[PDB]
Amino acid sequence: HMFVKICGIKSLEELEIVEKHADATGVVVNSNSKRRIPLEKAREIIENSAIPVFLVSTMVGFSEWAMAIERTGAQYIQVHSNALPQTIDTLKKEFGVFVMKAFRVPTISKNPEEDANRLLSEISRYNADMVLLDTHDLRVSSLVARKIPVIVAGGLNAENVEEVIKVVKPYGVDVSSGVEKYGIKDPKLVEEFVRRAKNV
Numbered sequence: 550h551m552f553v554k555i556c557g558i559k560s561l562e563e564l565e566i567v568e569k570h571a572d573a574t575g576v577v578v579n580s581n582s583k584r585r586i587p588l589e590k591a592r593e594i595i596e597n598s599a600i601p602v603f604l605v606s607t608m609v610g611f612s613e614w615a616m617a618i619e620r621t622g623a624q625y626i627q628v629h630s631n632a633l634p635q636t637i638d639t640l641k642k643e644f645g646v647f648v649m650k651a652f653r654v655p656t657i658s659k660n661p662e663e664d665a666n667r668l669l670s671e672i673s674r675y676n677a678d679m680v681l682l683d684t685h686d687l688r689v690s691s692l693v694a695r696k697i698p699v700i701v702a703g704g705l706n707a708e709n710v711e712e713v714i715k716v717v718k719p720y721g722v723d724v725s726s727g728v729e730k731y732g733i734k735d736p737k738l739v740e741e742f743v744r745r746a747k748n749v
Contacts, residue, residue, distance in 0.1 A: 554571065698720035
């Protein structure tokens with residue numbers, strides 16, 4: 550129905566919270582991010598999780614990816630970088646990882662239909678198992694989502710998730726800050742977000 554991923558957890562405690570209701574989670578490594586964690590903490594979250602844990606990074610290099618996967622035992626990766634199609638393809642073959650690749654959508658778009666078609670050719674260049682679209686304008690997202698399964702992310706929360714889902718009609722949604730309080734995932738926000746998203 551509606552895949553819900555809660556991204557950017559930093560502790561086994563946060564894992565337990567998201568594991569209750571979410572379909573997937575993610576740990577940020579080797580990125581300029583407030584959510585970044587050491588490889589040992591990533592390893593702990595991955596080994597203890599009952600749901601897919603995406604290893605999320607802005608790493609570009611085939612070999613830094615390989616080493617991160619080996620060091621963490623990740624079976625799911627989320628690539629937010631210009632890592633080449635060839636790198637993504639080789640990581641899949643060598644490691645059997647499921648690959649989600651992130652693509653930026655415009656904040657504003659002059660012609661939505663053409664921006665969607667442009668991102669779609671950009672997407673067909675990589676051989677990713679899932680597309681994540683990073684978000685104002687939801688029109689481009691709507692039209693990409695109609696052509697291919699996508700997870701949509703960017704500024705989602707309980708107050709806007711239901712509307713975003715109605716417009717975009719994605720395969721799933723991804724949230725981080727929207728379900729947080731003081732930089733820690735909030736059990737009541739998590740439960741509410743997932744419930745509302747699952748209802749549309």
